[PDB]
Tab-separated table of C-alpha atoms and ligand atoms in Angstrom:
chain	number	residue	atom	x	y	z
J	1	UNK	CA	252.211	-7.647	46.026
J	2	UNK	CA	253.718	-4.534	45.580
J	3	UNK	CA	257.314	-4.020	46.501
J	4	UNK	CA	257.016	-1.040	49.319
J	5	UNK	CA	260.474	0.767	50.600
J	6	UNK	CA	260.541	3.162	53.444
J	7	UNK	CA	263.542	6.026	52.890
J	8	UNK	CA	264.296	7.095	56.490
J	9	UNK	CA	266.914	9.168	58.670
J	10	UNK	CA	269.878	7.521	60.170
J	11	UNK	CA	268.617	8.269	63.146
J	12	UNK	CA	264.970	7.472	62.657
J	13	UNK	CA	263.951	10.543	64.458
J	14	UNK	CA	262.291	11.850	62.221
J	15	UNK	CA	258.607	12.564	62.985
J	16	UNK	CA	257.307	12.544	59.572
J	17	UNK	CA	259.259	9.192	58.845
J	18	UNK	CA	257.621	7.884	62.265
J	19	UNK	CA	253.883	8.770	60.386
J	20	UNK	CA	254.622	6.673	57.209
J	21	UNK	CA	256.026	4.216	59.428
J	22	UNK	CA	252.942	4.037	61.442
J	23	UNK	CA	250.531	4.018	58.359
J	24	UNK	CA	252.139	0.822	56.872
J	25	UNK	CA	252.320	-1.185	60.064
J	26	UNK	CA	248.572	-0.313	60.571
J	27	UNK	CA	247.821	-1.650	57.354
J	28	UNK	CA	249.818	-4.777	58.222
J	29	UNK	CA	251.628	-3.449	54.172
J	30	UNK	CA	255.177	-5.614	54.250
J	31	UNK	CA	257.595	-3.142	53.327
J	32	UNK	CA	261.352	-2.293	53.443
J	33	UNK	CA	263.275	0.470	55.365
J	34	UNK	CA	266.028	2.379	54.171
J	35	UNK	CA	268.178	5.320	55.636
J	36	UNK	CA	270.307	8.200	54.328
J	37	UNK	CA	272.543	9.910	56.624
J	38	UNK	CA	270.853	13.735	56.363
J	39	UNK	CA	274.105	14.732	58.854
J	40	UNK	CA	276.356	13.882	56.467
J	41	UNK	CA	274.258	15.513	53.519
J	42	UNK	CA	273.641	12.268	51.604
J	43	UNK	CA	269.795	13.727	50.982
J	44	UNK	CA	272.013	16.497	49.179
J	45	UNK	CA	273.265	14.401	46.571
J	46	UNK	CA	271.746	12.376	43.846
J	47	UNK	CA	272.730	8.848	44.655
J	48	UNK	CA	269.617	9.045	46.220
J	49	UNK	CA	265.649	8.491	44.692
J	50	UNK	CA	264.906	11.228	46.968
J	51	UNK	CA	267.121	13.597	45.287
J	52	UNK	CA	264.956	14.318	42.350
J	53	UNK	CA	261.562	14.042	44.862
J	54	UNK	CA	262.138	17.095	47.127
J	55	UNK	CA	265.329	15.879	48.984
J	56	UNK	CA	263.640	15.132	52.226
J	57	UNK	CA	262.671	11.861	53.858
J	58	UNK	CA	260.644	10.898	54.237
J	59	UNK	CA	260.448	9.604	50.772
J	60	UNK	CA	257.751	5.726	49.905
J	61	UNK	CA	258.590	3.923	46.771
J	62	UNK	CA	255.831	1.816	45.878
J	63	UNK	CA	257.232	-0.128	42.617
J	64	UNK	CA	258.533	2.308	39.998
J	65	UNK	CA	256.498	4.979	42.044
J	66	UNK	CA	258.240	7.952	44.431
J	67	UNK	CA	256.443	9.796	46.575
J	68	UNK	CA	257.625	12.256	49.248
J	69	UNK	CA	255.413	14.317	51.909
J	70	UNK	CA	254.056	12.131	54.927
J	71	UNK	CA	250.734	13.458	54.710
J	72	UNK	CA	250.852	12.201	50.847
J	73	UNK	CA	252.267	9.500	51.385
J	74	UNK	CA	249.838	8.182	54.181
J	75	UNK	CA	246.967	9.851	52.334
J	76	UNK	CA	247.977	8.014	48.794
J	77	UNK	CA	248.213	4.899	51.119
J	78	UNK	CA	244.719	5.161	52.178
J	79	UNK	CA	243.396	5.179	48.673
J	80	UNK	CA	245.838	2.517	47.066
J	81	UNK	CA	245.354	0.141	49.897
J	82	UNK	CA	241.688	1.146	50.534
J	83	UNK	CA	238.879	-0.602	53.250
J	84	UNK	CA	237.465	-2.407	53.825
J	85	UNK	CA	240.632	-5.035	52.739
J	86	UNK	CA	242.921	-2.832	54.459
J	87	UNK	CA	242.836	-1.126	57.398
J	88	UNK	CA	241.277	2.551	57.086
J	89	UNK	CA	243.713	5.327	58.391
J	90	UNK	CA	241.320	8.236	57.875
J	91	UNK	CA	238.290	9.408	59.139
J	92	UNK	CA	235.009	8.134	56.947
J	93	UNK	CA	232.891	11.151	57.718
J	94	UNK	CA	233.908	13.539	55.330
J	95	UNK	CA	234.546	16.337	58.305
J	96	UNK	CA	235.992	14.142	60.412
J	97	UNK	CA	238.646	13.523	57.785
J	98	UNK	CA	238.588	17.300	56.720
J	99	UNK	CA	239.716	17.513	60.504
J	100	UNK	CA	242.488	15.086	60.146
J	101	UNK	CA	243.709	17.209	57.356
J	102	UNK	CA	243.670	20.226	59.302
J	103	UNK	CA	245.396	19.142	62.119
J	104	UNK	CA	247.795	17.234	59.727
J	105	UNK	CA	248.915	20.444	57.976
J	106	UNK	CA	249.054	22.632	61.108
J	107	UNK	CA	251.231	20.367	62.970
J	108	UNK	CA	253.253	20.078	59.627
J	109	UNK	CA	253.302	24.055	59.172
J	110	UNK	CA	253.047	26.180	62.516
J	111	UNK	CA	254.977	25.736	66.188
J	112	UNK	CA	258.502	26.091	65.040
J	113	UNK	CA	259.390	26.596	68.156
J	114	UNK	CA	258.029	23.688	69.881
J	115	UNK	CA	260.358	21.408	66.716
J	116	UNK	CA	263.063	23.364	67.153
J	117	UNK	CA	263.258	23.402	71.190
J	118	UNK	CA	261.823	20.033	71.564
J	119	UNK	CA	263.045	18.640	68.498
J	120	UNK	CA	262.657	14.645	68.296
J	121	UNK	CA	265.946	14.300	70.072
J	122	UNK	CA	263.913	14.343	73.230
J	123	UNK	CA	261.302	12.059	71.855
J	124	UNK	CA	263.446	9.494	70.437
J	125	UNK	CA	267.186	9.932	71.945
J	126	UNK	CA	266.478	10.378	75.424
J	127	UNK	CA	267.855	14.073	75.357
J	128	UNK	CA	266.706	17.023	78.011
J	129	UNK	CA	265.789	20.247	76.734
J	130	UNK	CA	266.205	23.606	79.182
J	131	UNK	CA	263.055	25.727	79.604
J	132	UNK	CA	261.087	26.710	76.763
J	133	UNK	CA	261.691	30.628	75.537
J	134	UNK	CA	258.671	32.736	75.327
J	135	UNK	CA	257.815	31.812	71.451
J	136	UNK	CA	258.241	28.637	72.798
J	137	UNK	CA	255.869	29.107	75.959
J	138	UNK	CA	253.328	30.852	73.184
J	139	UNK	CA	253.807	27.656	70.864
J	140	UNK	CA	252.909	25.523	73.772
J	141	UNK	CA	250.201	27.500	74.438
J	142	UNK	CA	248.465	27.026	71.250
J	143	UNK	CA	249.074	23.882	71.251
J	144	UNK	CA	247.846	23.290	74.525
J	145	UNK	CA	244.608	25.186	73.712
J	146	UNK	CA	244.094	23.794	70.215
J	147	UNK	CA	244.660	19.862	71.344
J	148	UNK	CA	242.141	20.534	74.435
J	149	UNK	CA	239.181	21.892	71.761
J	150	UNK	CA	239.727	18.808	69.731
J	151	UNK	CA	239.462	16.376	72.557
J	152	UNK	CA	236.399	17.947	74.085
J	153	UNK	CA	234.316	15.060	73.574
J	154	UNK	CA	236.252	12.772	76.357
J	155	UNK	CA	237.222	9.850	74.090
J	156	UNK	CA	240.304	8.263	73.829
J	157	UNK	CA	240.831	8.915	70.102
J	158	UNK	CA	240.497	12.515	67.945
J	159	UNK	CA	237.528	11.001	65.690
J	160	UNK	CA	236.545	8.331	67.509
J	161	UNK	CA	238.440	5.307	65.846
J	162	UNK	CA	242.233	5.783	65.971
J	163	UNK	CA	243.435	7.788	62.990
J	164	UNK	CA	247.035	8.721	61.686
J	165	UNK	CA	246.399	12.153	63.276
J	166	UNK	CA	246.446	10.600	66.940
J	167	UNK	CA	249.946	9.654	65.665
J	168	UNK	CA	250.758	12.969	64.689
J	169	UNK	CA	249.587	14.856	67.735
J	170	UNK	CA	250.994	12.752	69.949
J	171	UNK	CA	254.081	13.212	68.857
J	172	UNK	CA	253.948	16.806	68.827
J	173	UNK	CA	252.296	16.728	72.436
J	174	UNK	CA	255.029	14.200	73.786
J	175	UNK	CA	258.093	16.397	72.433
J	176	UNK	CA	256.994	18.386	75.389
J	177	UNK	CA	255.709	15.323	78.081
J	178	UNK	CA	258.857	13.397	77.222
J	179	UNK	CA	261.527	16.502	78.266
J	180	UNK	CA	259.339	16.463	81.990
J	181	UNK	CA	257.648	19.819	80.672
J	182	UNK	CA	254.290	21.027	82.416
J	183	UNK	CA	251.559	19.958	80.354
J	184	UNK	CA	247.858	20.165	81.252
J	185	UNK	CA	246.702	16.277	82.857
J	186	UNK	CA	244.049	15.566	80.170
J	187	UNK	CA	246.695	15.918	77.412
J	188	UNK	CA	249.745	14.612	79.152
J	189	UNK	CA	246.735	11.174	79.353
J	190	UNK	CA	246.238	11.719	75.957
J	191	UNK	CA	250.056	11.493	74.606
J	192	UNK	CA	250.993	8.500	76.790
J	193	UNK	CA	247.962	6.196	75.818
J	194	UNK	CA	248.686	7.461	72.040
J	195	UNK	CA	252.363	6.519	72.605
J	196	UNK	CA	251.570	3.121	73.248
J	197	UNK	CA	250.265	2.146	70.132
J	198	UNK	CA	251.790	-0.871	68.522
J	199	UNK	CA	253.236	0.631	65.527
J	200	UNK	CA	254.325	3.518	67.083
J	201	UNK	CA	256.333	1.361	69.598
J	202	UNK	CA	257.803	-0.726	66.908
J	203	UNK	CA	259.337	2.616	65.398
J	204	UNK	CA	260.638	3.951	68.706
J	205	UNK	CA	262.419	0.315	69.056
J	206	UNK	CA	264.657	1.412	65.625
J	207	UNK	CA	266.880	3.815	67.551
J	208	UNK	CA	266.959	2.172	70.901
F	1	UNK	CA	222.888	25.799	48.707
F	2	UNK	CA	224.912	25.886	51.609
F	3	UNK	CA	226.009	29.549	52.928
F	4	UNK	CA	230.032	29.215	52.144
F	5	UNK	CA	232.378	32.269	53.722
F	6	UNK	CA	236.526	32.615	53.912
F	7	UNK	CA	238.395	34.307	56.092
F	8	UNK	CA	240.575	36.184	54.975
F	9	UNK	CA	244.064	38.742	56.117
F	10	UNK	CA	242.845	42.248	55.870
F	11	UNK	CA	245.068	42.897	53.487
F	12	UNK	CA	244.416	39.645	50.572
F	13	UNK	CA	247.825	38.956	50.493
F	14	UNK	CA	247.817	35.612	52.079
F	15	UNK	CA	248.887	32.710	49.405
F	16	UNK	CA	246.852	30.438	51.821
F	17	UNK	CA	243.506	32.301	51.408
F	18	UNK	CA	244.611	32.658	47.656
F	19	UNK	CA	244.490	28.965	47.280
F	20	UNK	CA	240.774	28.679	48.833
F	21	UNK	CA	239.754	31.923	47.040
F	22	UNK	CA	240.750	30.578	43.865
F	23	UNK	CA	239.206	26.852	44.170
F	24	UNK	CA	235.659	28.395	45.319
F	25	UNK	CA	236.393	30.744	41.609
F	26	UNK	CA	236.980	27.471	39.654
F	27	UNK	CA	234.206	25.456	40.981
F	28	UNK	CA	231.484	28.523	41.076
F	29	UNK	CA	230.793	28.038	44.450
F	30	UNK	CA	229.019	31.105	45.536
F	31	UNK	CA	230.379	33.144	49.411
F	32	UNK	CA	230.731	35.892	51.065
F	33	UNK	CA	234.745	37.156	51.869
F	34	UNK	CA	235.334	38.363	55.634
F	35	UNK	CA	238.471	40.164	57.389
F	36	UNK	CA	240.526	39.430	60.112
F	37	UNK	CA	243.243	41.880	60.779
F	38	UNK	CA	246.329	40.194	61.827
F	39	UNK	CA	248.948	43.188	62.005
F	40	UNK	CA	246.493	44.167	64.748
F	41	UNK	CA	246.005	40.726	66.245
F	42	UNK	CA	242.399	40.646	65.352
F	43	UNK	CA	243.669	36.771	65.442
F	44	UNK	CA	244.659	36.261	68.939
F	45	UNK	CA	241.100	37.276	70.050
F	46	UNK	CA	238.489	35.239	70.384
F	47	UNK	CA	236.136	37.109	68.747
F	48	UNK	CA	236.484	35.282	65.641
F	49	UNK	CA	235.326	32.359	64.712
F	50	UNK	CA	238.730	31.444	63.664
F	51	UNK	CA	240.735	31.526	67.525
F	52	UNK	CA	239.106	27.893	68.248
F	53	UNK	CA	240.533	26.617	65.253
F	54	UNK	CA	243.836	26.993	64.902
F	55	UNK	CA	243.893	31.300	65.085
F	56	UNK	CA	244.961	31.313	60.841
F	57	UNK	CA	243.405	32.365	58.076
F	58	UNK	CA	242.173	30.937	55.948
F	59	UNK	CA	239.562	30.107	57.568
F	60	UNK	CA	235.992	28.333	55.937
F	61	UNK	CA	232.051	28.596	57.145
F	62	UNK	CA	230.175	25.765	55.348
F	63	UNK	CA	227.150	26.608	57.030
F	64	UNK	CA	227.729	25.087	61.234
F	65	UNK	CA	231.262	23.694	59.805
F	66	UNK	CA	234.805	25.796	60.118
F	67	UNK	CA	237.213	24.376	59.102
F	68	UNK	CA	241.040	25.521	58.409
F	69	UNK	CA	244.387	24.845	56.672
F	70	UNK	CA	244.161	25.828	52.651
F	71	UNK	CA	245.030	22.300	51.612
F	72	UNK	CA	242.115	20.758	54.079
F	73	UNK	CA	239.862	23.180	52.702
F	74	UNK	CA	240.068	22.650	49.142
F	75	UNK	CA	240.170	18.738	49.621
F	76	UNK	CA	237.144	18.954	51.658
F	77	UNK	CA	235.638	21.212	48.797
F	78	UNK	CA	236.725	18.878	46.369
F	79	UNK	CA	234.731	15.680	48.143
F	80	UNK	CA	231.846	17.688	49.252
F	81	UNK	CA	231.284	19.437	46.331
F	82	UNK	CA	232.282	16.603	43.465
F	83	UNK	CA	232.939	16.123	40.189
F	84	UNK	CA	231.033	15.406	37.750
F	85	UNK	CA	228.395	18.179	39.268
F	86	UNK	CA	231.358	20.857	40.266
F	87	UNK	CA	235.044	21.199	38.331
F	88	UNK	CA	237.419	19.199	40.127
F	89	UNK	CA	240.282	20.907	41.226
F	90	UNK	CA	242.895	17.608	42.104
F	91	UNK	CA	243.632	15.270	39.587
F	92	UNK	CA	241.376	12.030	38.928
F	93	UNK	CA	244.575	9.744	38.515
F	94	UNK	CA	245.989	8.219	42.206
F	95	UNK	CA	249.194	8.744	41.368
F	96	UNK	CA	248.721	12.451	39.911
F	97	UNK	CA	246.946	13.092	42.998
F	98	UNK	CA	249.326	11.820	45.283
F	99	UNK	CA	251.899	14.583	43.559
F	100	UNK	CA	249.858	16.888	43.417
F	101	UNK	CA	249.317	16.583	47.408
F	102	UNK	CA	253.456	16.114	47.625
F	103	UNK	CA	253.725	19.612	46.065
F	104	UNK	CA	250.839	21.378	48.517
F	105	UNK	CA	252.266	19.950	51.445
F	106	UNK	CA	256.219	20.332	49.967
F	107	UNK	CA	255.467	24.487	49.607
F	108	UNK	CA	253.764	24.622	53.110
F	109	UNK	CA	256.902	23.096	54.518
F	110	UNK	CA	260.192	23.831	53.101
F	111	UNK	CA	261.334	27.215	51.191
F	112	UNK	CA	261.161	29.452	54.273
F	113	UNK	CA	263.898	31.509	53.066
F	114	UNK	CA	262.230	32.766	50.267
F	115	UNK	CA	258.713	33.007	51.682
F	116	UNK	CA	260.440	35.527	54.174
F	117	UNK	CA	262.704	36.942	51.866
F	118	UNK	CA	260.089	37.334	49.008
F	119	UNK	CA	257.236	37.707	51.114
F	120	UNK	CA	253.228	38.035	49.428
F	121	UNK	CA	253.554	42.095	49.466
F	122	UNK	CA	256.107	41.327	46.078
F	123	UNK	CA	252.987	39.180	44.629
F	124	UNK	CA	250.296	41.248	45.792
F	125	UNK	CA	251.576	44.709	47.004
F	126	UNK	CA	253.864	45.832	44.292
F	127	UNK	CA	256.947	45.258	47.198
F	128	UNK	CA	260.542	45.058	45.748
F	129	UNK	CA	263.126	42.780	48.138
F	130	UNK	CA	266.970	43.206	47.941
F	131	UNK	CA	269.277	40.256	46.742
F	132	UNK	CA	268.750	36.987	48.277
F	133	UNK	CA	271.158	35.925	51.235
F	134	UNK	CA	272.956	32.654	50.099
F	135	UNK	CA	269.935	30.927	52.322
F	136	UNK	CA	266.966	31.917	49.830
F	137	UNK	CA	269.712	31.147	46.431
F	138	UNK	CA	269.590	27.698	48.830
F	139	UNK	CA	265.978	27.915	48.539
F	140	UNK	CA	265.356	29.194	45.045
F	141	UNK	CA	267.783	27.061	43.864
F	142	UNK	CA	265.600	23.536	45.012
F	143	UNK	CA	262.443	24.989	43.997
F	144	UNK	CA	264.111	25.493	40.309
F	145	UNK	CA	265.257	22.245	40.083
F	146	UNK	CA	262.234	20.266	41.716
F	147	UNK	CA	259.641	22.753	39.061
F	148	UNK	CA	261.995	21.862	36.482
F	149	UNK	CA	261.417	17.954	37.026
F	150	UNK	CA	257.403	18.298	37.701
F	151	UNK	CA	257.489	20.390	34.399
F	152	UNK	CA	259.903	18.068	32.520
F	153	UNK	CA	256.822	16.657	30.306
F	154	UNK	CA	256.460	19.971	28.530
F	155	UNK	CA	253.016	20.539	29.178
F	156	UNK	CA	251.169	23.776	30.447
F	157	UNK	CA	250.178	22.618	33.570
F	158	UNK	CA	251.294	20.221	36.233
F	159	UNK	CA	249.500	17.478	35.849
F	160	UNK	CA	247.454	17.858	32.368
F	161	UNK	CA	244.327	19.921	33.181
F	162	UNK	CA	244.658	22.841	35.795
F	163	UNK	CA	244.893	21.828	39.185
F	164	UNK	CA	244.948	23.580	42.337
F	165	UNK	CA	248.881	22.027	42.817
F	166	UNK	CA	249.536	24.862	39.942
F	167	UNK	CA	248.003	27.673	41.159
F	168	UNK	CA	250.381	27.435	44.159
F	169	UNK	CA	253.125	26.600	42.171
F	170	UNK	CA	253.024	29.394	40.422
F	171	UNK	CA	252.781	31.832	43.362
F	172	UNK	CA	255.718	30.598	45.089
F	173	UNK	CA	257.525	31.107	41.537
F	174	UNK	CA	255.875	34.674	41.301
F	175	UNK	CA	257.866	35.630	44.385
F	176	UNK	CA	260.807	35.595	42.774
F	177	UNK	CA	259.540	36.371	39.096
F	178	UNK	CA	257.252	39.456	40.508
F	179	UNK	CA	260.497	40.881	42.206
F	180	UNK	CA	262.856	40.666	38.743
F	181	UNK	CA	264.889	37.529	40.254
F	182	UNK	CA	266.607	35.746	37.555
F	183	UNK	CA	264.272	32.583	36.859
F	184	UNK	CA	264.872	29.823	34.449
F	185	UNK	CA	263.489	31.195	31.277
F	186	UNK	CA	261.001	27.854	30.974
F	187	UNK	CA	260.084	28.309	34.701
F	188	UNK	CA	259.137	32.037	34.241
F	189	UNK	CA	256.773	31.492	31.590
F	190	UNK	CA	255.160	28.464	33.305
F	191	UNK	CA	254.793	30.967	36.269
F	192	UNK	CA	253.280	33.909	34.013
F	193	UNK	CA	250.758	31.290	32.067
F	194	UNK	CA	249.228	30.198	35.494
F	195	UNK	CA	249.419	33.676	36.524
F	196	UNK	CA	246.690	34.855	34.288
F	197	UNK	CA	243.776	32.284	35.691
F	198	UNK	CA	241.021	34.027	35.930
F	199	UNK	CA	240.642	32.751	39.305
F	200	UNK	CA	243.554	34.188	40.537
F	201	UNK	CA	243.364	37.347	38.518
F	202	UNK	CA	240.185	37.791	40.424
F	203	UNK	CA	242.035	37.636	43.732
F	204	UNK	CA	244.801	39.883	42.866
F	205	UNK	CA	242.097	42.670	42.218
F	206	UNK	CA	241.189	42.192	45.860
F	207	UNK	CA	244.293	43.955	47.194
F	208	UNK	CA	244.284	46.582	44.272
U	1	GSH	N1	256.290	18.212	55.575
U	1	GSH	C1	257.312	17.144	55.555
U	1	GSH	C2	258.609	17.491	56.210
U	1	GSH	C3	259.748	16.543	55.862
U	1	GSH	C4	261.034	17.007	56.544
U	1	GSH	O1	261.111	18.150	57.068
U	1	GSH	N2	262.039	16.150	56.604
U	1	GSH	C5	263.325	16.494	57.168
U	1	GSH	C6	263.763	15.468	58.230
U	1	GSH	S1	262.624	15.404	59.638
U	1	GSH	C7	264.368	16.517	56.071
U	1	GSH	O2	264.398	15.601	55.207
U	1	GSH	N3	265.260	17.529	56.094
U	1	GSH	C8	266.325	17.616	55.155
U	1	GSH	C9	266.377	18.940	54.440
U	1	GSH	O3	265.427	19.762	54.567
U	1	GSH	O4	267.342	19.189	53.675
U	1	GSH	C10	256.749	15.773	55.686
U	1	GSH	O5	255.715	15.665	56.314
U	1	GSH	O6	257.289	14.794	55.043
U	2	GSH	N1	249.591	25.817	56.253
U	2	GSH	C1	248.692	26.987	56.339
U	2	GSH	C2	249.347	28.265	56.752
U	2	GSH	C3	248.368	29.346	57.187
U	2	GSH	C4	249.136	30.592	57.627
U	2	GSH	O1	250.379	30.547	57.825
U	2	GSH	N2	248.457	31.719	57.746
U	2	GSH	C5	249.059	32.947	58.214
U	2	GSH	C6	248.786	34.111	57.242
U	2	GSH	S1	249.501	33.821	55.602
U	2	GSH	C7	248.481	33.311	59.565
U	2	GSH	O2	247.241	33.220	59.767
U	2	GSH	N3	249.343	33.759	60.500
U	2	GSH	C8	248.905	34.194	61.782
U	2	GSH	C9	249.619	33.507	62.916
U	2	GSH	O3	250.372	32.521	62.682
U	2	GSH	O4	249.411	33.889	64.095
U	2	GSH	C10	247.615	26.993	55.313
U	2	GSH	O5	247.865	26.448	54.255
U	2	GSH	O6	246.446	27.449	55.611
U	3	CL	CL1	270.291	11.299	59.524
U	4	CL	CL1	246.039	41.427	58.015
């Protein structure tokens, strides 16, 4: 048994913390959690692992392995603790899991203005937001547009069986539900039965 | 044989499409190289296959399948079209290839201030920038030190053989190297060695 520690915010807001979080509770992976206080710039000094990682959290150790990046860190998971003995958090088909990827990156890499304007504040703190600006109405837009394409097919789930990207979209979807923002019915559905996931729930209990 | 084609900016300045361009190069895939003109929105139409994605380039065509988001891409085209058969472009070792995915996603998502600052037109269009504000020495300064610890082993490349981790590497050290910004001598030449892979060579012609 491998000794697993999760390096999280203080706050454990953080959306990217929340996925690594998710992907180990999935897996049923014991593991241990562990903050630094990015407010007070503790991620900017090296008493910290993370330090000499990329000084971000969220940051796995896995024995006398660091990793950083949530989407390598979930993805590394995936192989290391592999089905059928544990729980698969990717896609099978190879272009369902190319799809995963995608939307893993893009959420990780585009809508600024949807984090910065509906930062996780309102997703895990309970805080209101005023109306969107106009990059924010065109971030919501895209989003909007891009998460209706992908759920075409009616089903509950992105790729049938849950993956780590329902995680991921969710979140980025309920940054906007949560702050009482209009958001197309379909989606809005989508969001709160993602939200409801076990391990996500178990994370949102850390900062209540 | 599968009919492969990228989308790329008009211009072949994108580091994105650089990083698809150049893994297609170093696994002899054969494709054809399309345009979408984004100064002119040619993006936010839907006349491209590339608006019901997620309206960025790159973008690939394996024959009915698009697919974007560089990273996706080239792990797709690294499980699709495997070693032994093609060149593998990620490392074979888990924990190699777990960094080597930290890195990827790491550039995507930090270093703004000097992928604004020292935008692709230094790399690619001959551009020259003015000093750095304080923000990209914030920036330059983290991508120094985290290079200098990946590189710490003394070895050519990241993680023994080429990888595509180094070819991106080395661009976002180009921006700063290609506009006569004071690099860590050991950094620089790590940045000039990758610079001449015939791969990428092959794309900077593109924009010539
Ligand atoms: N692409 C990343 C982003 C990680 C990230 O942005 N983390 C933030 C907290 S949510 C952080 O550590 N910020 C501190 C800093 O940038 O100095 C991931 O998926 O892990
Ligand atoms: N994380 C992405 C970023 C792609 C990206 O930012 N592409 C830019 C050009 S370099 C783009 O298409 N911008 C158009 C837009 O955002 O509307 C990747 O690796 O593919
Ligand atoms: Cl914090
Ligand atoms: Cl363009």
């Amino acid at each position: 048994q491998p000794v697993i520690t999760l390096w999280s915010d203080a706050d454990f807001f953080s959306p990217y913390v929340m996925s690594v979080y998710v992907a180990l509770q999935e897996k049923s992976l014991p593991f241990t959690l562990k903050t630094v206080d990015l407010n007070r710039g503790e991620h900017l000094q090296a008493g910290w692992t993370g330090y000499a990682a990329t000084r971000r959290v969220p940051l796995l150790e896995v024995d006398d392995f660091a990793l950083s990046e949530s989407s390598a860190i979930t993805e590394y998971l995936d192989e290391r603790f592999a089905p059928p003995e544990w729980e698969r958090i990717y896609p099978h088909d190879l272009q369902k899991r190319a799809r995963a990827r995608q939307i893993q990156a893009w959420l990780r890499s585009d809508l600024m203005p949807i984090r910065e304007e509906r930062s996780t504040a309102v997703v895990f703190g309970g805080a209101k937001m005023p109306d969107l600006s106009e990059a924010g109405r065109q971030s919501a837009e895209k989003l909007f547009a891009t998460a209706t394409m992908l759920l075409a097919h009616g089903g509950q789930n992105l790729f049938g069986e849950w993956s780590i990207a329902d995680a991921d979209l969710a979140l980025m979807l309920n940054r906007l539900v949560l702050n009482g923002d209009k958001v197309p019915e379909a989606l809005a559905d989508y969001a709160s039965f993602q939200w409801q996931r076990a391990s996500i729930q178990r994370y949102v209990a850390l900062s209540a």
